[PDB]
């Protein structure tokens, strides 16, 4: 008996890269790699409630107002620049704890980690999952602007997210580190609205395999749905189409349930759980990948 809960990858390699960036009385988080610091550009905005002429506020910038802090280090800004919706400041000191790292964008359905930091100080760590409309469900308290998302693979450190705005439904929009905004949302306090997120079928199937593994089986049906019928239904029901059974073939033989059988479950269960629960959830979550599920039920 296991249960299915988000975990985050350890934050130690990341924490020494998180700096306090202040300008005037604007304080937010920044990312310190090499002799550069990356942060959201609004730290220079005179105001953040109507549209800012950002190119004018770059001409307007004064380097002595910058107060960038990290431990015992005070970092002097040599120069300032934009890379998309973020600032790139060159500083006079190289981060002595710079890890090997890379930048990439996380794709819809993929899990990664948020290191939520209040004005320089890392505060908490948790797992999230990028959604098709380019938003996430964070917990971003005021103070955490510029907080950083990352994922570790092989074990290459990828920086994937930097936190920017909150939409009316509470969805959170960040940029990657090349400074492109997820979902294409502009860096302005304008009327912007989130579309509809397409559910990750791969993730939902993983979720259901987890429940079976756990010994939860009440939702399993006396019937099934072919891969090509599911995709035809998926297309008109805001679910992604399934390419291959292949990533599920271990999970399938280990439970004895085919993917075909979990496809029909997705269709019926989407109409509601009817008051019952699966792994204590009230509905299908698509936040766990097949990789996450395997790793926590079986290991490695």
């Amino acid at each position: 008996s296991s249960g299915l809960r988000k975990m985050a990858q350890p934050s130690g390699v990341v924490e020494p890269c998180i700096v306090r960036v202040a300008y005037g009385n604007n304080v937010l988080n920044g990312l310190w790699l090499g002799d550069e610091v990356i942060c959201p550009r609004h730290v220079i905005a005179s105001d953040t409630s109507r549209v800012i002429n950002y190119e004018n506020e770059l001409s307007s910038v004064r380097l002595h107002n910058f107060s960038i802090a990290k431990n015992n280090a005070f970092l002097g800004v040599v120069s300032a620049k934009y890379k998309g919706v973020n600032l790139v400041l060159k500083v006079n000191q190289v981060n002595p704890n710079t890890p090997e790292h890379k930048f990439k964008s996380v794709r819809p359905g993929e899990s990664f980690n948020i290191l939520a930091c209040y004005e320089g100080c890392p505060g908490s760590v948790y797992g999230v999952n990028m959604r098709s409309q380019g938003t996430i469900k964070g917990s971003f308290i005021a103070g955490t602007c510029g907080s950083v998302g990352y994922v570790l693979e092989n074990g290459t450190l990828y920086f994937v997210y930097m936190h920017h705005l909150e939409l009316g439904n509470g969805s959170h929009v960040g940029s990657n580190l090349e400074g492109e905004m997820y979902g294409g949302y502009e860096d302005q306090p304008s009327m912007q609205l989130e579309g509809t997120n397409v559910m990750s079928s791969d993730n939902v199937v993983a979720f259901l395999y987890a429940a079976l593994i756990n010994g939860e089986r009440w939702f399993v049906t006396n019937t099934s749905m072919t891969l090509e019928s599911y995709n035809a239904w998926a297309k008109t029901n805001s679910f992604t189409e399934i390419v291959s059974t292949d990533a599920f073939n271990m999970l399938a033989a280990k439970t004895g349930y085919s993917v075909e059988k979990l496809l029909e479950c997705i269709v019926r269960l989407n109409k509601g759980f009817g008051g019952r629960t699966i792994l204590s959830y009230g509905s299908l979550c698509d936040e766990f990948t097949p990789t996450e599920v395997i790793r926590q039920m079986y290991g490695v």
């Binding site: 905005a45 953040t48 964070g138 005021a142 602007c145 920017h164 909150e166 939409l167 959170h172 302005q188």
Partner: peptide
């Protein structure tokens, strides 16, 4: 409706 963090 977008609030800048």
């Amino acid at each position: 409706x977008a609030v800048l963090x």
